[PDB]
Nucleic acid binder design. Sequence first.
DNA 1: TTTTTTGCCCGGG
DNA 2: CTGTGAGCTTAGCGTTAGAGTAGGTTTTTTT
Lengths: 787, 787
Amino acid sequence: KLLLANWGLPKAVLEKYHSFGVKKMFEWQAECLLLGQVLEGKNLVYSAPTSAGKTLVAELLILKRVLEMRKKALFILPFVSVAKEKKYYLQSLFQEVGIKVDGYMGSTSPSRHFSSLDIAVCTIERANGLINRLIEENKMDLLGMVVVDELHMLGDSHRGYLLELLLTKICYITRKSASSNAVQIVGMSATLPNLELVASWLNAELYHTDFRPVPLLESVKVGNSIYDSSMKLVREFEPMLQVKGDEDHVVSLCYETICDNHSVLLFCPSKKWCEKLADIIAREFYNLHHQACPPVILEQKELLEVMDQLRRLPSGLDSVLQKTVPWGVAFHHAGLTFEERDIIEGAFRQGLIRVLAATSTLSSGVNLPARRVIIRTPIFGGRPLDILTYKQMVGRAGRKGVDTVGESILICKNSEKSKGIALLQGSLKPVRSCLQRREGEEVTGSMIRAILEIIVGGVASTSQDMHTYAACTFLAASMKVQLGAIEACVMWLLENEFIQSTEAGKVYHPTHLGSATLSSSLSPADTLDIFADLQRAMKGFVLENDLHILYLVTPMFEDWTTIDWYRFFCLWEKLPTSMKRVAELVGVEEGFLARCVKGKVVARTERQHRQMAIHKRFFTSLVLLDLISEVPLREINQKYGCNRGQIQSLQQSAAVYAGMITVFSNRLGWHNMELLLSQFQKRLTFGIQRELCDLVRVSLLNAQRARVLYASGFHTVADLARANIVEVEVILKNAVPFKSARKAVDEEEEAVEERRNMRTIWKGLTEREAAALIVEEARMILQQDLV
Amino acid sequence: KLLLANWGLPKAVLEKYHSFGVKKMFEWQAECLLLGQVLEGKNLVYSAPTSAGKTLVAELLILKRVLEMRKKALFILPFVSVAKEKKYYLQSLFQEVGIKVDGYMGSTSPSRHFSSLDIAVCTIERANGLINRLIEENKMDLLGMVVVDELHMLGDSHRGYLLELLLTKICYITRKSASSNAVQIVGMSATLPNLELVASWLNAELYHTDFRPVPLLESVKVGNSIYDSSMKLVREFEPMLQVKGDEDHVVSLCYETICDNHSVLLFCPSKKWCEKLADIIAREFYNLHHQACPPVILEQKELLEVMDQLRRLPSGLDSVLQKTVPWGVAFHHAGLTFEERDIIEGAFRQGLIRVLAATSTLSSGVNLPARRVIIRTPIFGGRPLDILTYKQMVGRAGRKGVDTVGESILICKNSEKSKGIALLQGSLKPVRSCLQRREGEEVTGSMIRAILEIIVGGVASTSQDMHTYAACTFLAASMKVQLGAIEACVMWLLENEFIQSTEAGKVYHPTHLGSATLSSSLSPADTLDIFADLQRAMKGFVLENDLHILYLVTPMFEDWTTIDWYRFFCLWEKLPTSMKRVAELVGVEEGFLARCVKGKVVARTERQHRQMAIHKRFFTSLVLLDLISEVPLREINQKYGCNRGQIQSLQQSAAVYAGMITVFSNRLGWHNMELLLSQFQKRLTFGIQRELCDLVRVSLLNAQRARVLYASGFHTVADLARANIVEVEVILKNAVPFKSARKAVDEEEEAVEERRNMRTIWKGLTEREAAALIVEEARMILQQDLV
DNA sequence: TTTTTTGCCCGGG
DNA sequence: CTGTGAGCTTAGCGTTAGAGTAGGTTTTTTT
């Protein structure tokens, strides 16, 4: 029965599973795969805890369908991190049968067009983008299957409502062609009260189970007392350690199980709070070792390899990590460089680290199981802790093979107790659409996009079809205004020129501003703020410097950071007129910055909303300029107050926004603006090729400078030590694009001073000085390397 | 001796000469080829009257050397019309031997890279341009021969001094290398004085003849009395058909030779005076036949075919050609189209036209003999006629031995008789080099080109090698201020950033602006303006429309027309609000336009020297904007005060200026601005697409408005007659680049009106109405073709 | 109160 | 928005910011 070898897998995949793990399925998996019609081809929704073999029940369906029918699966995952991990995992299983597995995730994408793949594993908005493009190609018939994780995100508005739109399009196009399942939807979720509604919407079969291989003792600590689920008072605890201001004994709650050689995962409200607790915990591991209780075992021979591997990173070994990592204490949050996450994840996954204070980043996207989970408060960011967040936090408790029973302890004040009791006793709110109009309110951005994305694809081009599409949404299940809201959208789309009216009844056609908003996969709420920037550049584009191209290209964010408007006003005042003119043409204005330094965010009329959206995008441009200007990432974080983890997210985004907005300007037909961006797409790439890595040892070589030496002479630093200073000076003078020292007639001097100060090679040296000093540096580097 | 077959020509060329020419040389041709060292590879400078077989000597020397030395030869010719004719001759002559003959002239380029050619037939600046690039590619060793026509041109300031700069380079690059010739030079110089000096400068043989196949009977008329050049009276004239319509009775002097039934040619100081006087003469041939020496034999059947060929002209038959051409009278201007000029010449070349009136456009650039030449006055323009122009006029008398003698008649009133006679009794002034200076004067721009070009090409870079170059000039040869002239050049080229000074004498290197000058082959004095326009565009470029890029690629002229400043000032206010913004950024201003309306004469400081060039260029940009906007030339002429010759020169020059300024911008490193210009150069062309030609012809559709139909549905006229009006309406809506109809916030209402106007057609049709009308015209005219 | 003339790399079948 | 303990700093008791997350066509290969 449960032994997987009986299920008829091809031996290569069976042997790969035998290598990867258990040969026998859990009983719930055998039931769920033996519902009456899921194997026939009917859609499915199911739920199991994250500790269960959740994805196996999809993988065996994928393996069957892609082998039994020569059609292409589309595996939709909530985050790039889990998408990358699942890509490599699934590649390892199927590759010996010849299934081509590749993914759309972050900046990475398949080296071949979708028609060559067999299983595309991708993030949600990559999948919706691919669905839009499959519609534009009308090649949708290729799509065999959609596998959806976290289907309970149907109601999440920041991201997730895309899952309504995406599944609705597949239903509608199937129903449009209908009026043996063409596209099977397999939807994985946490258990919901109305899960059978989602299953009924998807016409799906249903399974859900409480089964988990490792059981969880949930609890709330209040005072000394620990209450089990159903508030059974199982235990009282007394402080094994006495610590100044550890009024909750949070260190002792760690130490108690550290005495048992078991690890602790400690979720906190914020990054600052994680650093403070990783500091405090490491100080007590130090004190216990210094005042030398049971002994503490560390295997520091391994921690020195981890901590040296951190020292190699251009971040440097962070001042907190210097203190904590030697003791097996770490911290983990999205302020860390991706490599620092992967190092600290790996060190905790092997258990070299024993305590890891973390934000929600270890709740979603990072599967670090632990014996004991702790949640430092019921309040997060002044919210009550979300019930979905809590039940995803505690799902980390228990380690499959290393441990027998999982433990979790919420820490709660006596006055807060009702909130903790609610978190344990409560259950997830019923999932409900974002399409639903609130009774008296303006129609929602999810509905506006949901209507635009069919019209622009040439699907449901007449309004009677739009009512037929609305009847496919999950909203049309949640209600059992449904007609009147649709014609309130087309008014908004018409009066913003996303679509055109045509008589005969009527037919609606996409404008270029339609096709651009669709095929760049921007949101309609963004392409107004982008178009008001792109079109205003057509009226006067500064070509002598990058800042205006960066303002068009820089990612849209709201509150990318807390912004110091006063330092931004001090910064804007300092800009060169070469660049301050770009601020004027963009519309940055002293009358607006003066308000934003003097007072609150302006009340948002459409004018004041636009003028606010301009400045936050400009501030993000000045950061993004400094990144390409090779200003030290240590300096940038002083200058703008962001931190190194945000910068890598900005680098990841700006490299993509250059690509989107090129397609946006292409679809508008503004080909003369496209080329000015399609060239800049070559320069938003921040990692050097190995060509310069030797030359980059020379302190006077910016990569922009090493670029011309290697292009001119293939130089090894030995060659730069051999080179004649006169040849370097001429190579330097033939490196920079020509910019006069001459003042032209009716110029202001500041506009040419900034042409002169832009040619000195650091302010900085003149080339006659630099070309001597760089040969003297190179010959010193050479003799230091040869010894 | 003189029988050509004895000279050892290859039979293919010999038979081609037997076909095209005659089997014998003239006496002077043999005597010159028998100059002992010439056939050994000595340089030669020779003269023969232009009606003799001047070029046969040069052609025979090329043919021999390319067979024997087997090195590539460069044939330099004064004008593109002369170059094209001599290209087809040399190609048709040599190609049966397999000599790869092609050339560089006008917008033309050879079908393969230079090294593929055996002969390059070339205009002066395509040759001096080529010589610069052979030095950059260091292929100078390839150049085995240079052959030069009109070597007397060295004294022109506007042009042709390049023929000193080129030959001085070849001399210097020989003598510096050497201290059987490295290059053989053959120069033709039309019987100058000081011709021994030119021969001595090139270290060449001197050869001269006055031989003519038919003698020139010069004469001069005052009153009724005609005098020989010796001022003997030859005749008193009898003005048959006496009329007050010509107070000098030149109509009778034309009719006289017309009674001899031979062609006559008349040179006139002005287009309108030419155009008037052709009408006057034609109405007397009308008067003869309407009254009826015999009447003029008209052969009207051929003239009606010629006149129908003018009716077939895209610009239609000129009403003045309706008057004159049926009588065998025509006129000839730079103001005609080039097609009309070629047609009218050909009709005269076949002798169908028997009288032709011209400006100097028949002095130089073409050779069409006429038995009698008439010169209307000793005064041409505001000044006495140049004796060089007189000789090239009267040289037209020899009808290729189809007639036994040639005639010339200078005509004047009783005043200035001596200054008239001085054209007959005078001879060419001494040739000289415009590299010469006054003491109270700047070093001339032709010297600045010389001493710049050596530096930038990477030759003679040392401060003493330039004085070694100057010793090879024809200036220095003529002198056997000049020592300071080279130092004045280097100071001027430093202050204009064309060169860089490096220490340890000193060694000078090109800037990018140096190499950009030479690579574009612009003048230094032009490049100060073409750069300042580009440098100003970098500070704020209007991508919104075509006008601001046209201002950069607008051909730069002095007085390409008189500018009717009041009509231009009216045409300035009529510019749309976006185009009136371009006028701000380039610096067009009412405070200058109104001042040119107020008064023609202005003083000029450096500000005013730029301001004139800005406006004179901008006015020419407006003409280009209309020409790409498909405005009818019938309007443009009347709108700007322009004619169909000036327009045609501006089209043919603009296609080259967008070429040069790509290569100018590319090598300044402004690769963003380069790609805009390189993109726009793909639009700045005026040919007709093969497949669209009939579609644009029949339906009266603008080229892009038809092209998108062929792109969107491949319609022929027979298919557009079937097109659905709603489908065409949707195409008409989405064919254009997106211009939003909505006003933005923070925008002038007078600005958005433009963007909504741009989508209208012309009148002022809606897209609905145009999409109806276009289908009606297609389906109606389909029937008119089928009937 | 007014004459004629020239420059550039690159693609095509 | 909501909240609270962290933050500022000389001292020893003043004053508040605060989670994580993502979209593009061409292109893959070197001096």
